[PDB]
Design a protein around this nucleic acid. Structure first.
Ligand SMILES: [Mg+2]
Ligand SMILES: [Mg+2]
Ligand SMILES: [Zn+2]
Ligand SMILES: [Zn+2]
Ligand SMILES: [Zn+2]
Ligand SMILES: [Zn+2]
Lengths: 162, 162
DNA sequence: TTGACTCTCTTAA
DNA sequence: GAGAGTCA
DNA sequence: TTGACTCTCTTAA
DNA sequence: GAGAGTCA
């Protein structure tokens, strides 16, 4: 099994490679009518992606390193968290983008949490709009807002009460 | 079926049958430290469920009627909305529980909206905690809260900025 | 050891 | 959150 | 015609 | 949001 030093070396090589990805400046809503700026380190759209990286799905990548003749592979956003617990409250931990930009691999834009917590950030009002996440959001979620509901609650007769 | 008259008849028979489901009172968080009361009309746990109803999954049911000698079948919660557009902005419309209680078939607890809008209600602060849904929530979402994030954003080196 | 592809799986609406 | 088939 | 089961599918994290 | 195989 890989030692602590070996895991730290994997994290360090990953950071060195991701740090050379193109850095894209994005202006984003923070909530409360505030606007802020995020700097995403974006994996390229097509090969080559960077040393150790390969695409396993339309917006899925993996990081691969060979250590003492054994091939090791991780989801490309999971590498910053290899020294952390991998479950909590009986739920698997997932890499969660605070910038909501799947191509971004900036570890300052990632956290490590259940899939439900991860999904819920899509609707958060944001750090200046009422975010209650203990690990605070960096921006208002892209799906926050009044929504586009087509039809609301209704009945034709009188069989129901709310 | 095809005619507006036939659709209204389907909706009316569905309402009559669901109106005889047991009414279960649920006390719920509204947000803002307030509590309210919902009256859910709950489909039985096992057969028989009611005229026209059958279970296709652990918490999935279908309503079926024979019109013009043809069988017509629909998701059990979609029947109130048979006269509404079945898509919005190119996204499929779904039956969405405002009470977050899948066995409930009270149409006063249902709306018709995209799957994204539907999902997002799980994290809403609620009608007394800041809900901005244009079709307002009936309760705070069951997943609202600080979350249980295991690890936040971090880097080992100095290659990244937020 | 490495790159660039291939495939299928999990969750909860 | 969905659609559709097999039996009786 | 109605009931009670069976199976797989969609979406976007 | 994930893991794993093939081939050169
Ligand atoms: Mg996410
Ligand atoms: Mg729902
Ligand atoms: Zn980013
Ligand atoms: Zn938040
Ligand atoms: Zn209900
Ligand atoms: Zn709401």
């Amino acid at each position: 099994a890989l030692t602590n030093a070996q895991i730290l070396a994997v994290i360090d090589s990953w950071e060195e490679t991701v740090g050379q990805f193109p850095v894209i400046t994005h202006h984003v809503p923070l909530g409360g009518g505030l606007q802020g700026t995020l700097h995403c380190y974006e994996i390229p759209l097509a090969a080559p992606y960077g040393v150790g990286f390969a695409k396993n799905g339309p917006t899925r990548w993996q990081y691969k390193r060979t250590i003492n003749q054994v091939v090791h592979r991780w989801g490309s956003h999971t590498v910053p968290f290899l020294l952390e617990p991998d479950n909590i409250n009986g739920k698997t931990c997932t890499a969660s983008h605070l910038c909501h930009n799947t191509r971004c691999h900036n570890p300052l834009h990632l956290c490590w949490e259940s899939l439900d917590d991860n999904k819920g950030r899509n609707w958060c009002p944001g750090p200046n709009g009422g975010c209650v996440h203990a690990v605070v959001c960096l921006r208002q979620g892209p799906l926050y807002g009044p929504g586009a509901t087509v039809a609301g609650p209704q009945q034709r007769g009188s069989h129901f009460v709310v």
